[PDB]
Design a protein around this ligand. Structure first.
Ligand code: HEM
Ligand code: HEM
Ligand SMILES: Cc1cc(N)nc(CCc2cc(CCCN(C)C)c(F)c(F)c2F)c1
Ligand SMILES: Cc1cc(N)nc(CCc2cc(CCCN(C)C)c(F)c(F)c2F)c1
Ligand SMILES: C[C@H](O)[C@H](O)[C@H]1CNc2nc(N)[nH]c(=O)c2N1
Ligand SMILES: C[C@H](O)[C@H](O)[C@H]1CNc2nc(N)[nH]c(=O)c2N1
Ligand SMILES: [Zn+2]
Lengths: 416, 409
């Protein structure tokens, strides 16, 4: 591999030079002969061995002491030595609070699929490594939700539960996101609520949940501590800020009865710091409008409202070339942004977000030597080429610390 | 290893085996993906294997692999490669190689049509006057009074690199662009430089907003020569809108024939540096990129002005609203004039069907998601949800240098 890789912006002619890729740590899925850039996802007891762990820890500790301008210092060498002994005698080690915060912020900084990374240094890290029970997980998660929501002035935050040990004692949030709406399959094949969540809803019901069977039912939390069977908790509904969707011009848009929650909070990913694996690490930011207006509402296998919206707009739906779908899509996203702003809930439109990401990427090239980015995810799902990231060449590679996918827990859990 | 691709909307899973047959590199590595990079980075010795591989798959495609005709064709080609440092393709081979270059073009959403390609053999051309005649015939055939027909015209192959045939125009039909004294740009800003090369070469510019550029044609490595396409061959569509009466007053028009003329066609190790090819438009090519790119005609501000939209904040989505209207106007206008055009919903739907066909009959379909997904309304087209594997099969279309950067005058 060469030391210097160039990327061009085809709209502005700006060229940037990447050296950070020399620190990439593992596989994209691509090869010399095949590109897997559009592929979404390219044993329990299989935990890191002592010989695997030493280099991953040293690499992270080295990186940490470089960041605080103490590389090679006495504190750096003593931390290296203490980590070595801890791995040598316990087969693992514990991060200092400073290292945990640094590692979590850098996993976000390194997330090539995230357009919101200009905020990466401003992340509230909640250390929940003392947690031992699912009730305690629930407490921790409620405090996160209340802190992050902040009455509509949203604040990015992560909560980190105890790391994996032998793989039989994992902490997991079984929910894929902290706040999601239930989905219910009817005997006639139709779905009520969010069709994407039918499987997880059936698990919850089997576990004891009494479903209201409405269109927008907040799912309960399903929380697994120390490898035990997961337990159900209802999030207090006063902690779940929601927005009813209305339109600045179409009086009838409120009659659709749409709403959405304020807080996007991912809870199914794994945080990897210095070889350590944090299998429960819920993190949250705030929404870009297209996540709701295009994907949640207009994906065919989600709420799928395009038809009903186009009918109330009195569009010609007989041909595709009238672009009735595109017309209705824009009006739906106008209503989502207008609703969040009217209720003073943080939200960013896709123009502002992508423009901020270009500024962030240019600063990272200048100050850090690069910025890994997944164009397929960064470009928004509508109006792609009228945002600046469409025209921006990007390089994608995997730096650590990192957020990683992990198996769904109901597939791997051994029931007690 | 076999590779699976999933559609996340339909849950359809396809199995790719065809990638095991590629050799040309993608630019990616195990550590770095270059999927969004637009331009990632012969002799008798290297020529015979490529030639052999191509003849091999040709006779394989006609169910006569290892036949007598096939063996003696390989002898014929080897005999020719050492005694002349090259070889010539049979007509049947040229046609098959051109069709499969289109079939293998990862970035083209239009490939369901790949086997209906009219192939014009111009390998006997020797002068730029001949190139002009061949190109006029192509334009007339492909335009067909608005019932557009896919076509390619193939000029003589590269020999020593000093006698290249080149069409200096990036496309056969483009509008000129002019740098203005105050600093603005009239016409198409992407062609300001190419327009200057034409003006410098003697072209008398009308200095309008939609001036059809002349052909700049280079034969056998000589200086390029200017030619005017007879205007009755250049089909244009005035853009108007089904609802907005004022849209016609924007003065917008476009041409009906998209024809790429700056690419290189590689077949069996031979390099055809002049090979203009043409299809019909997807509406977004004009209404999104040509009209609404900030570096192109850049008309969003004007349209949203006539639409009386609030343009003070981004979150009004005034740009997205005006964008959809412009693209409605394009589709309505071509359709009203009976000029072939495909909307991005129909085009992407056909491409999924084409993917299904290719996995069934061929074991795969190389596809560049970055280029296949349309530049507007991405996730409400089915390709957004389709995983695609990208890999480089030959015969292929490739990029080549701009002629004004290599030419010794
Ligand atoms: C602060 C405001 C934020 C904004 C506006 C934002 C924006 C986005 C968007 C629009 C996506 C695409 C989501 C999808 O298509 O499903 C995304 C993905 C992602 N974000 Fe951010 N994000 C923010 C905060 C955060 C934070 C705080 C973290 C971690 C600490 C984070 C890590 C990620 C990751 C790992 C992904 C990829 C998720 C996946 O692969 O499914 N983001 N972000
Ligand atoms: C017949 C109807 C066709 C349609 C609707 C169609 C559609 C498209 C579109 C929308 C693009 C993207 C262009 C851009 O963004 O600049 C494209 C690219 C391309 N097309 Fe097709 N196309 C058609 C015919 C053809 C033909 C006849 C050929 C060759 C014989 C061909 C070869 C290619 C190639 C090589 C590219 C990539 C160009 C590049 O890399 O810049 N296409 N096509
Ligand atoms: C920190 C953060 C900020 C932000 N702005 N957004 C997200 C993403 C949240 C999210 C993502 C999805 C996608 C599911 C997986 N995809 C691949 C199908 C949802 F469904 C969902 F409800 C949901 F809240 C996370
Ligand atoms: C066979 C074919 C069918 C189709 N439907 N479309 C095309 C593309 C043609 C084209 C492409 C561009 C893009 C220029 C290069 N890009 C990277 C900036 C033009 F500008 C242009 F005028 C133009 F006709 C080709
Ligand atoms: C097949 C394709 O990779 C898939 O549909 C991707 C495309 N880009 C995306 N981009 C974002 N931000 N989120 C997604 O879920 C997807 N889905
Ligand atoms: C940087 C990026 O590769 C570039 O802007 C691409 C993105 N996708 C595209 N897709 C098509 N069809 N045409 C293009 O010109 C581009 N441009
Ligand atoms: Zn790749």
């Amino acid at each position: 591999c060469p030391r210097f890789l160039k990327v061009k912006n085809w709209e502005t002619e700006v060229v940037l030079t990447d050296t950070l890729h020399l620190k990439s740590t593992l596989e994209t899925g691509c090869t010399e002969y095949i590109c897997m850039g559009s592929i979404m996802h390219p044993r329990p007891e299989d935990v890191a061995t002592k010989d695997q762990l030493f280099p991953l820890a040293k690499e992270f500790i080295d990186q940490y002491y470089s960041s605080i301008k103490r590389f090679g210092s006495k504190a750096h060498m003593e931390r290296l030595e203490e980590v070595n002994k801890e791995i040598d005698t316990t087969s693992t080690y514990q991060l200092k609070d400073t290292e945990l915060i640094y590692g979590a912020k850098h996993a976000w900084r390194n997330a090539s699929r995230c357009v919101g990374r200009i905020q990466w240094s401003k992340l509230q890290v909640f250390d929940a490594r003392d947690c031992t029970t699912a009730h305690g997980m629930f407490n921790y998660i409620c405090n996160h939700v209340k802190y992050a929501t902040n009455k509509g002035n949203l604040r990015s935050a992560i909560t980190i539960f105890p790391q994996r040990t032998d793989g039989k004692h994992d902490f997991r949030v079984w929910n894929s996101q902290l706040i999601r709406y239930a989905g219910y399959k009817q005997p006639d094949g139709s779905t009520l609520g969010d069709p994407a969540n039918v499987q997880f809803t059936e698990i919850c019901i089997q576990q004891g949940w009494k479903p209201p069977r409405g269109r927008f039912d907040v799912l309960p939390l399903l929380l697994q501590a120390n490898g035990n069977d997961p337990e159900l908790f209802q999030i207090p509904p006063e902690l779940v800020l929601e927005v009813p969707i209305r339109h600045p011009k179409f009086e009838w848009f409120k009659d659709l009865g749409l709403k959405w929650y304020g807080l996007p909070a991912v809870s199914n990913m794994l945080l990897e710091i210095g070889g350590l694996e944090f299998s429960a690490c819920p993190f949250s930011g705030w929404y870009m409008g297209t996540e709701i207006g295009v994907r949640d509402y207009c994906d065919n296998s989600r709420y799928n409202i395009l038809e009903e919206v186009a009918k109330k707009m009195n569009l010609d739906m007989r041909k595709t070339s009238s672009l009735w779908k595109d017309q209705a899509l824009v009006e739906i996203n106008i209503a989502v942004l207008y609703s969040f702003q009217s209720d003073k809930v943080t939200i960013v439109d896709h123009h502002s977000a992508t423009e901020s990401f270009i500024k962030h990427m240019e600063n990272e090239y200048r100050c850090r030597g690069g910025c890994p980015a997944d164009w397929v995810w960064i470009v928004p799902p509508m109006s792609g080429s009228i945002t600046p990231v469409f025209h921006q060449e990007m390089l994608n590679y995997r730096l650590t610390p990192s957020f990683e996918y992990q198996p769904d827990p109901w597939n791997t859990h051994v029931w007690k």
